[PDB]
Write a protein that binds this ligand. Structure first.
Ligand SMILES: N=C(N)c1cc(-c2ccccc2)c(CNC(=O)c2cccc3c2OCC3)s1
Ligand SMILES: N=C(N)c1cc(-c2ccccc2)c(CNC(=O)c2cccc3c2OCC3)s1
Ligand SMILES: N=C(N)c1cc(-c2ccccc2)c(CNC(=O)c2cccc3c2OCC3)s1
Ligand SMILES: N=C(N)c1cc(-c2ccccc2)c(CNC(=O)c2cccc3c2OCC3)s1
Ligand SMILES: [Cl-]
Ligand SMILES: [Cl-]
Ligand SMILES: [Mg+2]
Ligand SMILES: [Mg+2]
Ligand SMILES: [Mg+2]
Ligand SMILES: [Mg+2]
Lengths: 5, 229, 229, 5
């Protein structure tokens, strides 16, 4: 699952 | 608000203590109380608000994914009921955050930096609602996330340099929105690549501290692109 | 009880789903509701109850330790107030567990295995109360933990082999009690060593599965002894 | 901090 900030 | 009787400064201080204690539900409650004092938030305070609710909803999302997968393999009412329970609590947290943004963080945010931050948050929490939405509210939620993200992008491109960490993180998250919510993987890949390349070309302008800030988020853009190609 | 309207079997099932979702507060609430149905608990159900509350109180203890350390370095009222808040919630969880044991898990537990399990839990939750206690209630709490642990030890030595995993874990935790609560490190070391050696000598009697169960806990005894010598 | 189960 991809990175988010 | 249960936090209405506590001083604004005490709420911020306790949010910082909750963070250190990894008590993110408390942290979010303290920061909600701070927002509800009615004054604008500083950069540090915006970051505290965002970290708190990102952690709360992140745990809810991870749990929802576990339960949804179990539910899917199983297709008694218990798995559905308990998935629904977690889903409802997650939607409640998202509605709370969106309520804070609409009453009245976004309207009072004059500076570009603050307005972009809050519009990014609005995109994020509509995205989390979209993850669990099923139906005609799903389309409306998705378009609402997109509009918030795109307005934030337009402001950030007018008002911030390509290495600004809020601009970079907005682009990172909007890219994820395109890929996992809007079924637009080419848009997601194009946005992460263009964002990465524009920031690379601007790194020469940064102090050692700013260089650190920007390259941290650029690494996440590269991490996602590696995953997607 | 908010769980009074849910079927016992559904509560157990949802506790197992909460565990998989790492939703330990839900898990504990489901298992509390199960206990409150009034029937005895099976081995698996006892393990579910214990895992749930161990995780809840474990997080509270970790947070309390962070805040207490900050409080100590600092010696505004905020750090003390927030430490006190976490402490009060922790004591509340401990009182809830002890209440379940006293109404009426311990009195209804006829089998040695169940009685030892619950007396060990009673020692554990008085130990957690002792960690945060200050005063004359502290001594009474400490002696209460010791009495529960020692009664469990006496039963386990009469009724269980030295490799039984509940016997081993009881001894592990009572040893920690001696070391960190009762200021009796030699008692703690003697108990972990004697427990370890007695179990080592009994491993020859175990199936492959039982061998796995016992050596897992024996490793924790060795881990603590390495730390203490 | 020591192990307990
Ligand atoms: N308490 C906190 N968690 C923060 C306080 C401040 C702060 C801001 C201004 C002034 C003083 C403190 C923060 C600014 N963001 C970061 O440093 C940061 C670092 C790494 C990764 C990310 C980051 O942001 C999102 C992703 S985060
Ligand atoms: N204009 C800028 N370039 C910044 C000004 C301030 C600032 C500091 C103090 C007071 C006011 C503003 C910054 C504080 N650092 C961050 O926010 C930050 C750092 C690393 C990574 C991330 C960050 O945010 C999201 C992701 S970055
Ligand atoms: N859902 C759960 N967490 C459990 C269900 C059952 C169970 C019991 C009987 C019948 C069916 C299931 C458990 C029995 N304990 C273990 O396996 C165990 C393994 C490693 C370490 C420890 C353990 O106990 C405390 C420390 S734990
Ligand atoms: N008498 C025994 N030796 C056991 C009988 C049953 C049992 C199984 C099914 C139904 C009824 C009883 C056991 C289930 N395993 C555990 O509890 C266990 C396993 C590993 C580690 C630990 C454990 O508990 C605390 C620590 S161990
Ligand atoms: Cl439920
Ligand atoms: Cl408080
Ligand atoms: Mg005031
Ligand atoms: Mg303003
Ligand atoms: Mg029934
Ligand atoms: Mg009985």
């Amino acid at each position: 699952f991809p990175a988010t900030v | 608000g249960a936090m209405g009787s506590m001083e604004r400064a005490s709420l911020i201080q306790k949010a910082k203590l909750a963070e250190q204690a990894e008590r993110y539900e408390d942290m979010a409650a303290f920061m909600k109380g701070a927002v509800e004092k009615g004054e604008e938030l500083s950069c540090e305070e915006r970051n505290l608000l965002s970290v708190a609710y990102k952690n709360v909803v992140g745990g809810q999302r991870a749990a929802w994914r576990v339960l949804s997968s179990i539910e899917q393999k199983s297709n008694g009412p218990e798995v559905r009921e308990y998935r629904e329970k977690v889903e409802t609590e997650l939607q409640g947290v998202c509605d709370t955050v969106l309520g804070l943004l609409d009453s009245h963080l976004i309207k009072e945010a004059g500076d570009a930096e603050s307005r972009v931050f809050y519009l990014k948050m609005k995109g994020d929490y509509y995205r989390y609602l979209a993850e669990v939405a099923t139906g005609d509210d799903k389309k409306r939620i998705i378009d609402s996330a997109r509009s918030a993200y795109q307005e934030a992008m337009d402001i950030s491109k007018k008002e911030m340099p390509p290495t600004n960490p809020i601009r970079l993180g907005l682009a990172l998250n909007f890219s994820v929105f395109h890929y996992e919510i809007a079924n637009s993987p080419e848009e997601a890949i194009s946005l992460a690549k263009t964002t990465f390349d524009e920031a690379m070309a601007d790194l020469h302008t940064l102090s050692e501290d700013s260089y650190k800030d920007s390259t941290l988020i650029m690494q996440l853009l590269r991490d996602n692109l590696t995953l997607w190609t």
